[PDB]
Amino acid sequence: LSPNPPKLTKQMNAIIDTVINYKDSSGRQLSEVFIQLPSRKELPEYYELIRKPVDFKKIKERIRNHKYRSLGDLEKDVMLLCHNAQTFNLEGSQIYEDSIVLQSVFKSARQKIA
Ligand SMILES: O=c1nc(Cc2ccccc2)[nH]c2[nH]c3cccc(O)c3c12
Numbered sequence: 034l035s036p037n038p039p040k041l042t043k044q045m046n047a048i049i050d051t052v053i054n055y056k057d058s059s060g061r062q063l064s065e066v067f068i069q070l071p072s073r074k075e076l077p078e079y080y081e082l083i084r085k086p087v088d089f090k091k092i093k094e095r096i097r098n099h100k101y102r103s104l105g106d107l108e109k110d111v112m113l114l115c116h117n118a119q120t121f122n123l124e125g126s127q128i129y130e131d132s133i134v135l136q137s138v139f140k141s142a143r144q145k146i147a
């Protein structure tokens with residue numbers, strides 16, 4: 034392909050920063066637990082269950098290192114993050130429900146920015 038235009042890189046960061054900075058009615062930053070996954074030594078149970086792990090740190094690195102070739106590719110990884118959160122955590126639990134919100138916050142951001 035062609036290198037990531039500065040405008041696309043700026044859009045990808047603007048979208049991910051909306052998700053990360055997002056807060057609920059209570060004043061809680063939902064992304065907090067999703068920024069960094071615990072290590073394989075800290076939580077081996079998660080790595081046994083989850084095939085393709087990702088956190089917001091890895092997504093920022095993939096934006097920075099021009100790994101996402103479209104906003105669709107970025108979406109695929111944000112959707113994967115949330116799916117893993119929904120797979121590993123019990124339905125109705127805080128982490129599980131926060132991931133459903135962040136999925137929506139991403140789509141809202143994507144359509145607003147792009
Ligand atoms: O599903 C997850 N469960 C926990 C459980 C936990 C909570 C608090 C302290 C220690 C462990 N931490 C997590 N960090 C993430 C990062 C990205 C994606 C994720 O799906 C997760 C994720």
Ligand SMILES: [Zn+2]
Binds near residue numbers: 116120
């Ligand atoms: Zn799956």
